[PDB]
Design a protein around this ligand. Structure first.
Ligand SMILES: Nc1ncnc2[nH]cnc12
Length: 247
């Protein structure tokens, strides 16, 4: 388990939370000093709970699958909420077991469905610590008219932040303000599995990728990444999706 409290939060306390979250995920190996996530884990080891408290002291617990940092559902009070996907009915056999009511949300938790459900693309959804406070509030008083957008703020403030130092930093520096994520953030989010796959191939091919990954930079320039000396591998990506946990 890992916790983050919005009351009294600072850039620093967010960074501590995201480092603790990365640490919570099991890894036996590192490649280029980056933790390589496990490809399979027994149920009793597969989930971690992130407890989030907003400024108003209301708390939600978020269940994540530690092999892929995917959120499977959350609990607020006596009720649990899970994504509609097989992996989420599997998580429900292990977490939030003594919830009184269990609701299955109407979507897998993937972005193309959440953006359709929210009627907004990620670039137009505010992030930053105040946005995370508001997302905790909206999910705690669940309403289908508002939950998709809040879930995308949740996912980006936890999973994507844990996957990339750049996303962590950008969100954490907004302690009293909010901001729209640049194409750079959208591109890192989109590309996590492909970058992870190539980084593992590189470790068996002298640091060279077998297929390039195109990312968007700070100038909204499309850049082609082809090896482990690229800044995204040396100083940004912080977790690797195991090649045998995609296919
Ligand atoms: N539920 C989820 N958890 C983590 N990363 C995601 N990216 C899209 N949906 C996600």
């Amino acid at each position: 388990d890992v916790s983050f409290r919005l009351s009294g939060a600072t850039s620093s306390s967010y960074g501590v939370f995201i480092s603790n979250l990365r640490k919570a995920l099991p890894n036996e190996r590192k490649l280029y000093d980056i933790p390589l996530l496990r490809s399979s884990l027994p149920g009793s080891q597969r989930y971690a709970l992130i407890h989030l408290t907003n400024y108003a002291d209301e708390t939600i617990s978020v269940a994540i699958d530690v092999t892929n940092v995917y959120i499977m559902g959350y609990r607020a009070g006596d009720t649990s909420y899970f994504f509609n996907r097989a992996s989420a009915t599997e998580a429900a056999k292990y977490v939030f077991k003594d919830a009184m009511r269990k609701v299955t949300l109407p979507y897998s938790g993937n972005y193309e469905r959440l953006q359709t459900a929210a009627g907004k693309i990620r670039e137009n959804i505010p992030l930053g610590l105040p946005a995370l406070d508001s997302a905790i509030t909206t999910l705690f008083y669940y309403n289908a008219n508002s939950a998709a957008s809040a879930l995308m703020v949740l996912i980006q403030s936890t999973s994507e932040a844990a996957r990339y130092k750049f996303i962590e930093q950008q969100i954490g520096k907004r302690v009293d303000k909010t901001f729209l994520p640049s194409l750079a953030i959208i591109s890192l989010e989109n590309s996590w599995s492909a970058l992870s796959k190539q980084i593992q191939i590189a470790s068996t091919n002298n640091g060279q990728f077998e297929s390039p990954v195109v990312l968007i930079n700070a100038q909204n320039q499309r850049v082609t990444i082809t090896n482990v000396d690229a800044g995204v591998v040396t100083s940004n990506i912080a977790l690797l999706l195991n090649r045998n946990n995609m296919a």
